[PDB]
């Protein structure tokens, strides 16, 4: 019999043993384990997606994306385990190198020095540069998705909400609504809910920077509509120009209804922060996504000048294109694609 963790079977032996619980979601569980073959500690995610089309879609995306990606600040896939025939495949197990902690945990236990904050931010943006150069949007950056070892190496994880958006094509009206985790959610996810861009990831990074500076989330909305109020309580009411940019009439009128709010200066919120950090914070937390700093310009900001080196910041060799996006398909078809995508890890595979 295979090992079992909190009632879930983890059919991953004999290679992977000594499973310990780490966490879960709606259709899976993550455990730590020991790889007896390579003699390394791993994290193993069990996914059981095949009954729901949206779970299948996200599983395929995460797999396709992470199997192409290779970057020091992004967690790689070491192995994928699943059944030898499509009919027996109910679960998929993804294996990664085990990291020691994550930023969410670290921020519960430790006040970070400015030097730590600066280096972590550099690593997040260096990883993001690579992700955005591939035409991928992460869409769920937050502290618990940033893994760390005690050597201060940072890696971005969780591509379960990530997708490709080929910039040759206007995706306005075609992106999934209600992405990101609420506190890290850019205002245009609420106001241009089907037409946002990779700029949402910069917003989330700004939220993360704010959180490193104070060990608390900057915009802790209690519900979807309160989120936008939290944002505007600090940024203040948008300029008329920024309102006049909002293409969606219902959204623009909804903002016109709201009472006026003044800008809270960054240095009253963060009176002990490095001034340059606050400058970069302001640029990342810019209301208008077309005025918000892009990842390359953020890396070039004075705050990160001791680390910025475009000769050592890889970009994707083969950015993903519109081909990698037509996954709006029946769940049974997505299962076939997941089976094909994971075939290279099976005994007897041939291309």
């Amino acid at each position: 019999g295979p090992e079992m963790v909190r009632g879930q079977v983890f059919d991953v032996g004999p290679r992977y043993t000594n499973l310990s619980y780490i966490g879960e979601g709606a259709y899976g569980m993550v455990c730590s384990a020991y790889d007896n073959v390579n003699k390394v500690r791993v994290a193993i995610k069990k996914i059981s997606p095949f009954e729901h089309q949206t779970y299948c879609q996200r599983t395929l995306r995460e797999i396709k994306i992470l199997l192409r990606f290779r970057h020091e600040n992004i967690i790689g896939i070491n192995d994928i385990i699943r059944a030898p025939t499509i009919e027996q495949m109910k679960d998929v197990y993804i294996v990664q190198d085990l990291m020691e902690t994550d930023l969410y945990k670290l921020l519960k236990t430790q006040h970070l020095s400015n030097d730590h904050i600066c280096y972590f931010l550099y690593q997040i943006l260096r990883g993001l540069k690579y992700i955005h150069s591939a035409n991928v949007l992460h869409r769920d950056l937050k502290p618990s998705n940033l893994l760390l070892n005690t050597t201060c190496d940072l890696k971005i994880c969780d591509f379960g909400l990530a997708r490709v958006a080929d910039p040759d094509h206007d995706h306005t009206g075609f992106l999934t609504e209600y992405v990101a985790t609420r506190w890290y959610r850019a205002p245009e996810i609420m106001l241009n809910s089907k037409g946002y861009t990779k700029s949402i990831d910069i917003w989330s990074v700004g939220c993360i920077l704010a959180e490193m500076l104070s060990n608390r989330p900057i915009f802790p909305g209690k519900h979807y509509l309160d989120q936008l109020n939290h944002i505007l309580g600090i940024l203040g009411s948008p300029s008329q120009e920024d309102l006049n940019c909002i293409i969606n009439l219902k959204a623009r009128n909804y903002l016109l209804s709201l009472p006026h709010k003044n800008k809270v200066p960054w240095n009253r919120l963060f009176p002990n922060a490095d001034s340059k950090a606050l400058d970069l914070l302001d640029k990342m937390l810019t209301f208008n996504p077309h005025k918000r700093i892009e990842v390359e310009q953020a890396l070039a900001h004075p705050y990160l000048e001791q680390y910025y080196d475009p000769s050592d910041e890889p970009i994707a060799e083969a950015p993903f294109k519109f081909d990698m996006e037509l996954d709006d398909l029946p769940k049974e078809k997505l299962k076939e694609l997941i089976f094909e995508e994971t075939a290279r890890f099976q005994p007897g595979y041939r291309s």
């Binding site: 600040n73 030097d115 005690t150 050597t151 201060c152 190496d153 680390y307 080196d309």
Partner: peptide, 14 residues
């Protein structure tokens, strides 16, 4: 318990 930044390989290169 978090080590100095210079224990990171990436930082050593910089």
């Amino acid at each position: 318990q978090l080590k100095p930044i210079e224990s990171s390989i990436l930082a050593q290169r910089r």
